Motif scaffolding. Structure first.
Motif, mmCIF file in Angstrom:
data_model
loop_
_atom_site.group_PDB
_atom_site.id
_atom_site.type_symbol
_atom_site.label_atom_id
_atom_site.label_comp_id
_atom_site.label_asym_id
_atom_site.label_seq_id
_atom_site.Cartn_x
_atom_site.Cartn_y
_atom_site.Cartn_z
ATOM 1 N N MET A 1 0.798 -1.218 0.000
ATOM 2 C CA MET A 1 0.000 0.000 0.000
ATOM 3 C C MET A 1 0.831 1.269 0.000
ATOM 4 S SD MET A 1 -1.431 0.234 3.836
ATOM 5 C CE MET A 1 -1.587 -1.475 4.327
ATOM 6 N N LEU A 2 2.105 1.176 0.378
ATOM 7 C CA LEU A 2 2.989 2.327 0.515
ATOM 8 C C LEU A 2 3.436 2.898 -0.806
ATOM 9 C CD1 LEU A 2 4.578 3.658 2.979
ATOM 10 C CD2 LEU A 2 6.286 1.943 2.562
ATOM 11 N N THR A 3 3.440 2.091 -1.861
ATOM 12 C CA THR A 3 3.926 2.469 -3.183
ATOM 13 C C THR A 3 2.782 2.537 -4.198
ATOM 14 O OG1 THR A 3 4.614 0.192 -3.621
ATOM 15 C CG2 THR A 3 6.143 1.629 -2.629
ATOM 16 N N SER A 4 1.558 2.807 -3.709
ATOM 17 C CA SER A 4 0.347 2.851 -4.517
ATOM 18 C C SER A 4 -0.424 4.142 -4.255
ATOM 19 C CB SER A 4 -0.530 1.648 -4.185
ATOM 20 O OG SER A 4 -0.928 1.690 -2.825
ATOM 21 N N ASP A 5 -1.293 4.487 -5.197
ATOM 22 C CA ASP A 5 -2.206 5.621 -5.134
ATOM 23 C C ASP A 5 -3.651 5.168 -5.178
ATOM 24 O OD1 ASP A 5 -0.204 7.719 -5.088
ATOM 25 O OD2 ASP A 5 0.012 7.401 -7.261
ATOM 26 N N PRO A 6 -4.578 6.016 -4.735
ATOM 27 C CA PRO A 6 -5.983 5.669 -4.850
ATOM 28 C C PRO A 6 -6.341 5.381 -6.294
ATOM 29 C CG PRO A 6 -5.731 7.541 -3.409
ATOM 30 C CD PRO A 6 -4.383 7.287 -4.015
#
Ligand code: NI
Length: 379
Positions: free
Chosen positions: A80-85
Motif C-alpha cells: 500500500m505504501l507504493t500505490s495511489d488511490p
C-alpha cells in the motif's frame, strides 16, 4: 535550469538543512527535486493527486498480477505504501482497524511485561541497549499482534535488515535468496496460525505476490523504525540530561514526540510528479522525482519556534516523522506505545546513564544506531 548545493565536509546535515531552508527550499539539483521547508513538504505529502507514491509500477503491473503472470519480482515493490488511490484505499482498508485504541490498551500489559523481561537481561557494567532492548521489543510485539511465532529472533533480525535496506529495488527475487528464501518459506509455513488481519489478507483477491508484500510490510517494515525511535530517544534524553526532568514531570509522551521531531528515524521520503505542478516559486515537470526531507521540515522555525533546541515538553509538536496525508503511518500508534513503555520502564530501572560507545546505522535515509553501549547505576 539546474543548480547544485550539497552538504560539504565541514557542515553537518542539519547545518546544510538550515541553509537550504533559508536560501533554496525547493531545489533542482539537475537530477531530482529536493524539498526542505515544512510548508512545501507538507504540501507535497498531502497532494497525492499531483505527487504520486506509485514509484514501483504497482499500478502499471497490477493486471499482470491479478490475472497471474509475474513470478520473480520483489514483493516489497507491491504494497500500500507504493500505490495511489483507488488501489491504496482498497489495500489500506483491510487493516486500518488493527491498531485501534481498544486493542492497544489490551496489549499494554504484554508490551510492559516484555519490556521488563528485556530489561532484566541488561548488564549495568556495560551493555548494548540496541541489542538487548531496541531490536527485540518490536519484533516480539509485532509477532504477538500478527500471530506469527518467531523462533530464532536473530534470523529474523537478519531477514528484517535484508528486506528493509533494499526496499523497492527493481530486481529479481534471486538477488539474495540465501536469507530471503528462508523468509518466504517462513511466511508460507505460518500463514495459518495468523491473526484476523493476516487471514483477511491471505483470503483476498490479491495476487500471491501482493499477499506476500502486504504481510512483509506489516511484519517487518516497522521493526527498524521502532528500534531506531527507542535508541534515538535514549541518546537524546541522555545527551540533553533530561532523564530526571522527564521522570519528575511525567514527560514521556511529549518527550518521545520531541525525539520523533528532533531525531526522526526516517529522514526523507519520495514522490513522483504526474503532471506539471507549481511548488512554491518553482515549476516541476511531469515525471520528476521529489525527495521530501522530513528531518529538515521538522526543524523549520516557522513551525517550531527555537527549532534547533530539544524541548522535552514542546507543544504543539506537528512533526512529519510519520508522514502526512493519505499515507500517514498506519503503525504510528504502535510505534509510539512501544517507545513510551520502553522509555518508561527503562527510566524506572536505571538512575545514572553514561554513554560508553556508539555506532550509527550507516545510511542517509534511516537514522539510528547499530550499537549503543551504556553504563547504568541501579537503584
Ligand atoms: Ni551540473
Amino acid at each position: 535550469h539546474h543548480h547544485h548545493h550539497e552538504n560539504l565536509y565541514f557542515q553537518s546535515n542539519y547545518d546544510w538543512f538550515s541553509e537550504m531552508r533559508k536560501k533554496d527550499p525547493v531545489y533542482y539539483d539537475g537530477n531530482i527535486w529536493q524539498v526542505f521547508s515544512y510548508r512545501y513538504t507538507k504540501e507535497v505529502l498531502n497532494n497525492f493527486s499531483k505527487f504520486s507514491s506509485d514509484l514501483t509500477g504497482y499500478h502499471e503491473r497490477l493486471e499482470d498480477l491479478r490475472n497471474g503472470k509475474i513470478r520473480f519480482d520483489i514483493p516489497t515493490r507491491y504494497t500500500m505504501l507504493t500505490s495511489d488511490p483507488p488501489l491504496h484505499d482498497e489495500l489500506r482498508s483491510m487493516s486500518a482497524d488493527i491498531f485501534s485504541p481498544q486493542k492497544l490498551q489490551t496489549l499494554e500489559t504484554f508490551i510492559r511485561e516484555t519490556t521488563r523481561s528485556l530489561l532484566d537481561s541488561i548488564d549495568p557494567r556495560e551493555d548494548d541497549i540496541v541489542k538487548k532492548l531496541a531490536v527485540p521489543l518490536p519484533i516480539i510485539v509485532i509477532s504477538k499482534i500478527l500471530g506469527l511465532p518467531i523462533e530464532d529472533k536473530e534470523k529474523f533480525k537478519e531477514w528484517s535488515d535484508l528486506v528493509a535496506f533494499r526496499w523497492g529495488k527493481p530486481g529479481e527475487i534471486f538477488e539474495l535468496g540465501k536469507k530471503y528464501l528462508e523468509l518466504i518459506g517462513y511466511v508460507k509455513d505460518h500463514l495459518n496460525s495468523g491473526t484476523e488481519v493476516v487471514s483477511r489478507v491471505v483470503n483476498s483477491n490479491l495476487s500471491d505476490i501482493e499477499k506476500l508484500g502486504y504481510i512483509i510490510l506489516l511484519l517487518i517494515a516497522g521493526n527498524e523504525g521502532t528500534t531506531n525511535l527507542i535508541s534515538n530517544s535514549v541518546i537524546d534524553f541522555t545527551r540533553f540530561n533530561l532523564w530526571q526532568r522527564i521522570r519528575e514531570e511525567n514527560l514521556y509522551l511529549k518527550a518521545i514526540e520531541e525525539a520523533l521531531r528532533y531525531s526522526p528515524p526516517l529522514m526523507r521520503t519520495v514522490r513522483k510528479t504526474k503532471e506539471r505542478v507549481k511548488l512554491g516559486d518553482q515549476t516541476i515537470e511531469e515525471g520528476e522525482y521529489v525527495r521530501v526531507w522530513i528531518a529538515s521540515a521538522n526543524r523549520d522555525e516557522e513551525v517550531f519556534h527555537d527549532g534547533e533546541k530539544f524541548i522535552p515538553d514542546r507543544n504543539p509538536n506537528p512533526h512529519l516523522s510519520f508522514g502526512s496525508g493519505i499515507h500517514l503511518g498506519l503503525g504510528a500508534p504502535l510505534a509510539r506505545l512501544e517507545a513510551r513503555i520502553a522509555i518508561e520502564e527503562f527510566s524506572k530501572r536505571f538512575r545514572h546513564i553514561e554513554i560508553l560507545d556508539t555506532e550509527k546505522v550507516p545510511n542517509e535515509v534511516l537514522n539510528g544506531y547499530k550499537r549503543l553501549v551504556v553504563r547504568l547505576k541501579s537503584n
